């Protein structure tokens, strides 16, 4: 059944695995490496960007809300992003077309919750660390 079970078949055993790790869906970001092709930043971790709009992405069914996201154009490459700003409020902390450090969204490439197809998350807007703004633990830059 199956394997080349000889003792002088380690050529077939390595050329088989070499040809059949392509069907390991997650080891096709070692092989074909589409990171520099399909990721919005060229394989990095974070990204500085410049906000272009305020997109009210509505929630997917069977949850009704409106997620209040933000459409970023970066400065790294001139890709486009629809990022996301969490924890209610803090669209009031945007002060539009002022720069943003967006980040990955923790499901490694997919949208997470009821957000349809939005893959990112604001972590710093105008360099003041948004988690230190719901408490207003640091001062918002206003003037």
């Amino acid at each position: 059944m199956g394997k080349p079970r000889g003792l002088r078949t380690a050529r077939k055993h390595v050329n088989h695995r070499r040809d059949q790790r392509w069907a390991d869906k997650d080891y096709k970001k070692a092989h074909l490496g589409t990171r520099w092709k399909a990721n919005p930043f060229g394989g990095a971790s974070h990204a500085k960007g410049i906000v272009l709009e305020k997109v009210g992405v509505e929630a997917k069914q069977p949850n009704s809300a409106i997620r209040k996201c933000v459409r970023v154009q970066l400065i790294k490459n001139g890709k486009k992003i629809t990022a996301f700003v969490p924890r209610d409020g803090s669209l009031n902390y945007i002060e539009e077309n002022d720069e943003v450090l967006v980040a990955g969204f923790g499901r490694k490439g997919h949208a997470v919750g009821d957000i349809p197809g939005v893959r990112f998350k604001v972590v710093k807007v105008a360099n003041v660390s948004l988690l230190a703004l719901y408490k207003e633990k640091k001062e918002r830059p206003r003037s």
Binding site: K54, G56, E58, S90, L91, N92
Partner: protein
């Protein structure tokens, strides 16, 4: 759709905002591990409560 974002941060605007102001600045590392012994042993002698939970309020 994007019908309105004009209700962003709504329930924070409907919050009464009472305060903390007190509560007795607590013991840190080693002494904090001292203080987590009375809250187990004797209170709570594992008496029969007929399938209940220990850190309950009511």
């Amino acid at each position: 759709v994007h019908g309105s974002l004009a209700r962003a941060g709504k329930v924070k605007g409907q919050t009464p905002k009472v305060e903390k102001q007190e509560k007795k600045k607590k013991k840190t590392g080693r002494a904090k591990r001292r203080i987590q012994y009375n809250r187990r042993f004797v209170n709570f002698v594992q008496g029969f409560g007929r399938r209940r939970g220990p850190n309950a309020n009511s």
